[PDB]
Amino acid sequence: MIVPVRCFSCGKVVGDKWESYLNLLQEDELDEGTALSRLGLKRYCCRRMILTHVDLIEKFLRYNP
Amino acid sequence: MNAPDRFELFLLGEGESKLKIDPDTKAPNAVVITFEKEDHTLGNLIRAELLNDRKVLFAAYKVEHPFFARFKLRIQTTEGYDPKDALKNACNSIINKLGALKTNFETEWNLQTL
């Protein structure tokens, strides 16, 4: 549903930058790797945590309830 | 359905002693100290400090099972040297080293503007 609060591997907080990640991908039209590096994700654990996430919360909210 | 009490790992149970010291008959002047609710963190450091002492002969730490937060330290010293005294000296040396490291880190952090 929502981006995980902390990285599973190390525990770094990654939920703050999900909106920033989307803005960089859309507003700045930057590639995935460049946006992730700008956000400040060095270890590939957080990189795959952010990149591999899927926003199912929006799809669930598409329904009336 | 029957997962272990997570808090129980680092919390002493009712009617349980933190340390249990018993004699060892395998070798002369050998003792076994069972540490309860402890992990490799303290056992490895204590054993490493003990091995750094010339008088101490044997110092080995063993974890019976990952399920139970407990380990056993076998300590054998020379004749006339009580193992408890050696353990106390090792702990005091560890405390002194930790204090020195803390002071050095604080001084370095204060020196650096960032």
């Binding site: 199912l56 799809k59 669930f60 598409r62 329904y63 | -």
Partner: protein, 49 residues
């Protein structure tokens, strides 16, 4: 030198479950079959409702 027809892409021969397998050729066929059978039992979002 005739080749009256050709495949759009060989990978399409795989089924729904087999296609999920990364590099099926690099893996042994019994392992691919086991993966295809097991994929039906994987826990995940099946629908958004």
């Amino acid at each position: 030198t005739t080749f009256t027809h050709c495949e759009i892409h060989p990978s399409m021969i795989l089924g729904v479950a087999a296609s999920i397998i990364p590099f099926p050729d690099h893996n042994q066929s019994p392992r691919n079959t086991y993966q295809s059978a097991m994929g039906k039992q994987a826990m995940g979002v099946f629908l958004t409702n």
